[PDB]
Write a protein that binds this DNA or RNA. Structure first.
Length: 95
RNA sequence: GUUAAGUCUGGUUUCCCUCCAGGGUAUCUAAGCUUUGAAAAAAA
């Protein structure tokens, strides 16, 4: 099963508060980055249970169909303008 | 070639009781009282 042993946010949450931004992801470069349409791209450190074989990243980045159906599993439009604690933003970005 | 964007769909149908048993057994009256007391032979 998929186990996310840890993900080192608390830096993405910083640059998110009081704003309404779309948090895009990208997994090429072998390190998970978290693009923000509010013009910042924080590289995310994480440890998972699945080892993406470095062939799968390329198979998804090259196949224009895969990278197209990947738009739906890639982003959230987080709205922190109103009351927005850090913990629930953590769970949002974690999921 | 470059970018940028995902969009649609988020439980339906059927079945809602069927069969057997629908009373059986015991008791079905019992014990008393079964006539009594007045008038039986009357005046013309």
């Amino acid at each position: 099963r998929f186990e996310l042993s840890y993900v080192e946010l608390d830096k993405v949450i910083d640059c998110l508060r009081n704003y309404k931004r779309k948090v895009s992801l990208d997994f090429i470069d072998n390190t998970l980055i978290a693009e923000i349409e509010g013009s910042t791209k924080i590289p995310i450190s994480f440890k998972s249970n699945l080892d993406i074989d470095k062939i799968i990243k390329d198979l998804v980045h090259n196949n224009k169909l895969l990278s197209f159906e990947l738009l739906g599993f890639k982003s959230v439009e987080i709205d922190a303008t109103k009351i927005s604690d850090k913990k629930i933003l953590k769970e949002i970005l974690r999921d």
